[PDB]
Design a protein around this ligand. Sequence first.
Ligand SMILES: *[C@@H]1O[C@H](CO)[C@@H](O)[C@H](O)[C@H]1NC(C)=O
Ligand SMILES: *[C@@H]1O[C@H](CO)[C@@H](O)[C@H](O)[C@H]1NC(C)=O
Lengths: 49, 98, 98, 371, 53, 159
Amino acid sequence: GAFGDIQSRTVSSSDLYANTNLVLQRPKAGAIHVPYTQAPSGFEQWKKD
Amino acid sequence: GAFGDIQSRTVSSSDLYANTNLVLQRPKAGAIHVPYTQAPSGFEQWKKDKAPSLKFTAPFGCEIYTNPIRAENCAVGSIPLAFDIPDALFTRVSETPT
Amino acid sequence: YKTGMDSPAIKCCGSQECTPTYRPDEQCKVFTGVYPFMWGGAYCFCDTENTQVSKAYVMKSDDCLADHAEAYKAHTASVQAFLNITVGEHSIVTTVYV
Amino acid sequence: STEELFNEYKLTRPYMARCIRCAVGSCHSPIAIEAVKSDGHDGYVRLQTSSQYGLDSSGNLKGRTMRYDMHGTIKEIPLHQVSLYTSRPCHIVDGHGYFLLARCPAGDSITMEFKKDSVRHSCSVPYEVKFNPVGRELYTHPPEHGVEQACQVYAHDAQNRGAYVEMHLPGSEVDSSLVSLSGSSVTVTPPDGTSALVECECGGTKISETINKTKQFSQCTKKEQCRAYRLQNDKWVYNSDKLPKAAGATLKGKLHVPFLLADGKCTVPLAPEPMITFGFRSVSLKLHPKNPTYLITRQLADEPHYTHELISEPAVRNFTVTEKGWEFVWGNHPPKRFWAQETAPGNPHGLPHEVITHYYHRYPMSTILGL
Amino acid sequence: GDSITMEFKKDSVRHSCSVPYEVKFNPVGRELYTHPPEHGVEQACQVYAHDAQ
Amino acid sequence: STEELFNEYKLTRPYMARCIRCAVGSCHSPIAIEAVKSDGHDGYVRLQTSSQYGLDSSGNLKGRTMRYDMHGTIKEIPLHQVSLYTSRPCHIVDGHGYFLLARCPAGDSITMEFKKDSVRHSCSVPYEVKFNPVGRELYTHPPEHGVEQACQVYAHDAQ
Ligand SMILES: *[C@@H]1O[C@H](CO)[C@@H](O)[C@H](O)[C@H]1NC(C)=O
Ligand SMILES: *[C@@H]1O[C@H](CO)[C@@H](O)[C@H](O)[C@H]1NC(C)=O
């Protein structure tokens, strides 16, 4: 949720650092989907502030 | 306009108390309708201003549960205990290791 | 709550008389000088000596049965505790008041 | 099957009422909405209209169409043609008789419309629509994923046991189209199937109650000098405030209504897990809400110092935690508790000095007093 | 609203046009309402006549 | 001409997915929107749906229609019938395969709908839509007149 949550050494670098606090959740009974938890894009927050 | 504007002694009770400040008004000329004046539902107003619940505000970490209305895990005070135990349940030292 | 509103008692070229009604917060008033209109044209010929009686009352909402608040008064509270007591390798589940 | 599906519809019949605006001005249209309820927490609306639908003109079960009283006759159109909106178009869920269950968004008023065989008709009524989101998180639409919490929602089931309303015989329905001046005298059709109630303010004959007969009325220069009412005396109507009552008698009974509010389960968002930073008698919380979420905290002491706030933008707040205990609740996440204990600098040996200021931090409110 | 959008269906893809103009009508009376009430009192106001005169 | 217009569409085929609300409850409909991007400064939306369109069932180039998986079979309807809105009706600009470019106004959620051979189907997904006005002046719609400044916008070109 902070500026620089997703970092890449260079533009073409395939390896990258990610810290989004991704947490998987329990899916709904009878529904096929992948539940997840993540912090809002820090890029957008910084762009706003 | 206050919480409890419409009251009923019990759920099944047919008789009920009502204080809405109902005032009839003059109808429009050429229009058939029943004009009226009433205070806003006090239930809705209270629901909007209901404030945080007792469950969240109760001290000592007391947790509040409904249906069998009860309070749990209230960490306050202490409780004395008395244990009337017959001598038959006591074990002699000679039976225990030294 | 819901404001129960009765159908207008419109007397054309005449006058009505109001009567007591036994409803919670029941209001009733007589109005004169009305020339009601309908989809099919002017309801009453006369422009004067016309009476339109409006009656309304307050009644419980049909949703109240499931969605309602219950006001209680509480006093003289008692505490019931669930203690796991083991006395000399005798494990039991005890439900006992304080 | 059963009177609930047989319905008092066969006894009732839809009726017309005045709308504030029908497009170009007001009108007496059957689309008129009598009342709107918005108690359900899931955002569904229960509208009570002046018309009835779900059963066709013959009383057969057909939910695909809706029945509206088009002036002197009654017409039916498919229900899917009927649309409604408040801020954005709503989704109709179900219906039975007078009542309508639909998914409407938030808005300041409800507009309902349908296409006739001519220019489309609409009617707007002022009513505050504002549904309380389920849970301690204020969302606009339900999330894809979340936890299951108890809620109260409008059931779509037509099963009805608790709630009921009063319906009664309608009053005389005026219809000026019944009367014309054939050559020079008042001539009224009954018409074929309806009893014609005609009364004149002027002299001569002031009572007709003509069941079925074409009659001429003298001493009436213009058709405006007479009035004529359509009397049915066959069916009941809802106690509407826009149709005049019958003065002779009010035959009435109790009839149950569909779409009862009932308990259920709802999908609610889960407040994002904050970052927790530890310190001396203090916890640092990094909040990053996805939506306006209520933060509530309390102490476990005699003085809770209860503090709450609706936080919609990221922010870091610090709270003081004593050994007596501190509870933390964040949105719909299960409550967590954290207690505090001697952190630093403590009370080492540290000869000399040093330990005096170390003891300063341990057991405050005094310390300096003893020194 | 903040802008006015007008549209109509041609014999092909529907055409629309939006222009920026502040639209904010002052409610009639000392009470700030969104839509006119079902019942009320009659007060003087200024409104656009529909008459072609 | 070229694989970009030939498209992997011939290899892919549209599919169905769950929507939160399909009108009366949830359902497994092809209209489901996978993701939405709102980075363009001009207010255009780039929606990724579970279905594909721009090419017909035989793989011929036909942008007038859209292809959706109707349960056990696959049906196609004209694209002009498909409508969408957030606060007010949007204007569809272009499309290719899974992706859709349209002029939507500001709003709290995106609703997309189209008329089938029966009751119309719709699906709403929660996503924050808020386009940053171009320049130091916060406008709702672009003005009739103004100065030319640099910006970043979604190109409609299929390249
Ligand atoms: C006490 O009770 C819990 C469950 O109530 C049980 O799991 C535990 O084994 C018990 N311990 C003893 C010592 O009896
Ligand atoms: C508490 O807040 C202040 C500023 O408000 C900040 O400098 C400090 O680092 C915070 N405490 C912790 C433990 O992060």
